[PDB]
């Protein structure tokens, strides 16, 4: 075996074709399935795995009540091969209420965060064993990507934040080798808030698109150099913005360097990627709630801040059905690197008061150079009939 390097060119994407679905909430009405939120997908050189933060309980269980809180002592990182639902035989890889994972070409790295809100710990687990640990530097909810990390020539990178969600915060980029922390860089450039980054290999470096909870409805961008640990940042130029809430496409605007200051407060985890001067991206169909999901290409949207010329729209989930977090992952092909994405399908409390629990299903799509049709692939569970 050898470490991954991702040195192949990006594939010629024309849109996205269906790849997988879990059906977790429909199976839960007659089966022992784990309660989860904040899922993600990552792949070793041979196959893909689904990850999720469990709530330490099955769905048809007295412990499923009040599962809405994001931080508790019982949360653990679940791991399965893609397509196998989270049943009682699932492996718990670490204690965590926030996490990130990746495979370096030899073994898995897991980054796991747990502890008190004002004194949390981050554990680095590599090849099955704890190798390093670090403590909250700003004493205010240490957190990471909720999605895969990226590794080149054995050096993995991860984005971590500490501090306020509605003001200035401390963001650092950690460089890791076989679980050992080897370097740390502080955030640099014009990005003013950085949460929940989605990252992809762009040899020789790494590129990340993130969430701005403070002032932008446009998404921040972070570029990371693996050879000299240098960092730079900016915003997605596109006039069609990716965050939620946001202004309608008739009145929205963006800036390549600064938060657009339009419906800036709050947000949702998402993704976008460059295709020459064009940008591919996904977002909720509704502008002020996490309903539906759509993807499209914006012409010159990576370099021209005034462009609103879209093409190749696809609906993934129609406007009447709930969505949630979404994120990119990369798969190596015979001659090029493909981009794929996943969508969290949240159900239950606080919006759906028919039940006491909160949980999610998932759906997965991959970039295609071929042709495709139309459809909608929602969660599909009937909360009016299944257990409360």
């Amino acid at each position, epitope marked *: 075996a050898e470490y991954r390097n991702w040195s192949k060119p990006q594939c010629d994407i024309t849109g996205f074709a269906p790849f997988s679905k879990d059906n977790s909430i429909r199976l839960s009405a007659g089966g022992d399935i784990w309660v989860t939120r904040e899922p993600y997908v990552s792949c070793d050189p041979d196959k893909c795995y689904q990850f999720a933060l469990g709530q330490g309980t099955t769905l048809n269980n007295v412990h499923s009540n009040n599962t809405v809180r*994001d931080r508790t002592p019982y949360r653990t990182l679940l791991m399965n091969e893609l397509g196998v639902p989270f049943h009682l035989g699932t492996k718990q890889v670490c204690i965590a209420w926030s996490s990130s994972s990746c495979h370096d070409g030899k073994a898995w790295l897991h980054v796991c965060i747990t502890g008190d*809100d*004002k004194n949390a710990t981050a554990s680095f687990i590599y090849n099955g064993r704890l190798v390093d640990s670090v403590v909250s530097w700003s004493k*205010e909810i240490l957190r990471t990507q909720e999605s895969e990390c990226v590794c080149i020539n054995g050096t993995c990178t991860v984005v971590m934040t500490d501090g*306020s969600a509605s003001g*200035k915060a401390d963001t650092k980029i950690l460089f890791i080798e076989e679980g050992k922390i080897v370097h740390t860089s502080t955030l640099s450039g014009s990005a003013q808030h950085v949460e929940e980054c989605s990252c992809y290999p762009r040899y020789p470096g790494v590129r990340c698109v993130c969430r701005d909870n403070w002032k932008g409805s446009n998404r921040p961008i972070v570029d990371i150099n693996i050879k000299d640990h240098s960092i730079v940042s900016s915003y997605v130029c596109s006039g069609l913005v990716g965050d939620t809430p946001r202004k309608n496409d008739s009145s929205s605007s963006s800036h390549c360097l600064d938060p657009n200051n339009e419906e*800036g407060g709050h947000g949702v985890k998402g993704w976008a990627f460059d295709d020459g001067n064009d940008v591919w991206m996904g977002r909720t169909i509704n502008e002020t709630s996490r309903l539906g999901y759509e993807t499209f290409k914006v012409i010159e949207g990576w370099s021209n801040p005034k462009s609103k010329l879209q093409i190749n729209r696809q609906v993934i989930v129609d406007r009447g059905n709930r969505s949630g977090y979404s994120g990119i992952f990369s798969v190596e092909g015979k001659s090029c690197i493909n981009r794929c994405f996943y969508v969290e399908l949240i159900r239950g409390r606080k919006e759906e008061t028919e039940v006491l629990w909160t949980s999610n299903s998932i759906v997965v799509f991959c970039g295609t150079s071929g042709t495709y049709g139309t459809g909608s692939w929602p969660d599909g569970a009937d909360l009016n009939l299944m257990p409360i």
Partner: antibody
Framework: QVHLVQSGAEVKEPGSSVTVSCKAS????????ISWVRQAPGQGLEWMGG????????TSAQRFQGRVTFTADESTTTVYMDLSSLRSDDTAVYYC?????????????????????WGQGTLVTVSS | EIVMTQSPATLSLSSGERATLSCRAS??????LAWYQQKPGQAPRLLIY???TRATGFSARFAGSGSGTEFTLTISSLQSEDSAIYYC??????????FGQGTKVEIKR
């Protein structure tokens, strides 16, 4: 009873800083957030910020984000608010209040952030 | 960010009659709306929360109404102690927690 008790009135010169404090009479600092709200003469109410007494996450309104800081102590069972770079315009009654909210979700934000109980209010005036 | 508009600006009515106040939000606040009463020379007091339920200090004569973007408060059989300023406030998920500019009530004796 639980009710909040505030520090006395103050006069401060421009460019100076002021400390105001708020204590629970019942010793019962549960994790419900303590918030600061001000009222300028003949003008409406204005939220400035707050903190959870046990979990310790502070928050501030954008207009005051460079100027104000919050801290708390369970032993004195008191919340302390510091306002810096004072000007004549800051002359107002400052009230501490107890919110219906006691947890913050990383993703979903806050819930029940309305003020159930209020302190006596402290008059702060900025003058030479 | 979210703007709260309250009307009328001033209201005056005689004792023994019904009075009504209204509040509007620049976006839908999904029932995350509260009302306060402030008597002259005193700290404000919570009157209603979640647009629908009244605090321990007030009786059946006070009622809340509305949802989404428009809300209403009604006082039944007005009395001498009702002469005060009233304010609406939203608390929809994220800061800042903006208040309305308030409505003043004075009694036409």
């Amino acid at each position: 009873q639980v009710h909040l008790v505030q520090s006395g009135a103050e006069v401060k010169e421009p460019g100076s800083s002021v400390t105001v404090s708020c204590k629970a009479s019942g010793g019962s600092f549960n994790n419900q957030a303590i918030s600061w709200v001000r009222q300028a003469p003949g003008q409406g109410l204005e939220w400035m910020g707050g903190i959870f007494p046990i979990s310790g996450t502070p928050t501030s309104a954008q207009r005051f984000q460079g100027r104000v800081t919050f801290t708390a102590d369970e032993s004195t069972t008191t919340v302390y608010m510091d306002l810096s770079s004072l000007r004549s315009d800051d002359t107002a009654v400052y009230y501490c209040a107890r919110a219906g909210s006691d947890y913050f979700n990383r993703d979903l934000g806050w819930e029940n952030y309305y003020f159930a109980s209020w302190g006596q209010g402290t008059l702060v005036t900025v003058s030479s | 960010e979210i703007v709260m508009t309250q009307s009328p600006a001033t209201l005056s009515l005689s004792s023994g009659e019904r009075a009504t106040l209204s509040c509007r939000a620049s976006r839908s606040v999904s029932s995350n709306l509260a009302w306060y009463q402030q008597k002259p020379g005193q700290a404000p007091r919570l009157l209603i929360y979640d647009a629908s339920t009244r605090a321990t200090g007030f009786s059946a004569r006070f009622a809340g109404s509305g949802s989404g973007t428009e809300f209403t408060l009604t006082i039944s059989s007005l009395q001498s102690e009702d002469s005060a300023i009233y304010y609406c406030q939203q608390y929809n998920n994220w800061p800042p927690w903006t208040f309305g500019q308030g409505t003043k009530v004075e009694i036409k004796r």
